[PDB]
Amino acid sequence: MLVINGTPRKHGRTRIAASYIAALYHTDLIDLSEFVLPVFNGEAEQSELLKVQELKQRVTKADAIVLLSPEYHSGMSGALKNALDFLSSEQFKYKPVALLAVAGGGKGGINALNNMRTVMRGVYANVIPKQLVLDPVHIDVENATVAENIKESIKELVEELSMFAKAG
């Protein structure tokens, strides 16, 4: 199982959620805060840089992926989209994915999720129905860990994810 962090900020609330999941479930983690690539420009050499082929590998290797991204202007992080512009259906096709967005509370989050969904569906991925949104109240920035009150949600999300993974 793979976990991708969307927040390009080394000190982001989304980064915490990523670490939690990837850790507590022992999964391959790709923190976009440190794992940084160049802004896609569509050029052969680029599609063969350093981190680029590693990204394509780790993604096309995981059975199921847990995609996390913060809501930036009612959409996923420009960082996460840029990294996705390097990949394609060749690494996501029919691959089980579980969307999870981190917003600043309120009604935020839904637009981010739908964005990630529409894009994932475009690369023929398989987004599971169950989706989650983490507000600041769900993140304990104090001890860089998710608040207990949400651990239950996250559980069944990943749990439902694996369910789809085994099915097909």
Ligand X SMILES: Cc1cc2nc3c(=O)[nH]c(=O)nc-3n(C[C@H](O)[C@H](O)[C@H](O)COP(=O)(O)O)c2cc1C
Binding residues vs ligand X (CB under 6 A) = 7, 9, 12-15, 42, 70-74, 85, 88, 102-104, 106, 108, 122, 136
Cβ–Cβ < 8 Å for 130, 154: no
Site for a copy of itself contains 47 (CB under 8 A): no
Contact, 16 vs 145, CB < 8 A? yes
Say which residues have a Cβ less than 8 Å from residue 77's Cβ, sequence separation at least 6.
Answer: 6, 7, 8, 32, 69, 70
At 143, the amino acid letter reads: N
C-alpha 153/C-alpha 71 separation (Å) is: 19
**66 vs 165, which CB is nearer to ligand X?**
66
What's 140's DSSP letter? Answer: E
- Is residue 59 part of the contact set for a copy of itself (CB under 8 A)? no
Min dist. Cβ of residue 155 to a copy of itself (A): 29
Contact (Cβ atoms closer than 8 angstroms) between residue 78 and residue 95 = no
Closest CB to ligand X among residues 154, 165: 154
Residue 121 binds which one of a copy of itself, ligand X, none, with CB within 5 to 8 A depending on kind? a copy of itself
Q: Does 119 bind a copy of itself (CB under 8 A)?
A: yes
What does the binding site for a copy of itself look like in residue numbers (CB under 8 A)?
Answer: 8-12, 33, 36, 39-43, 72-85, 88, 111, 115, 118-119, 121-123
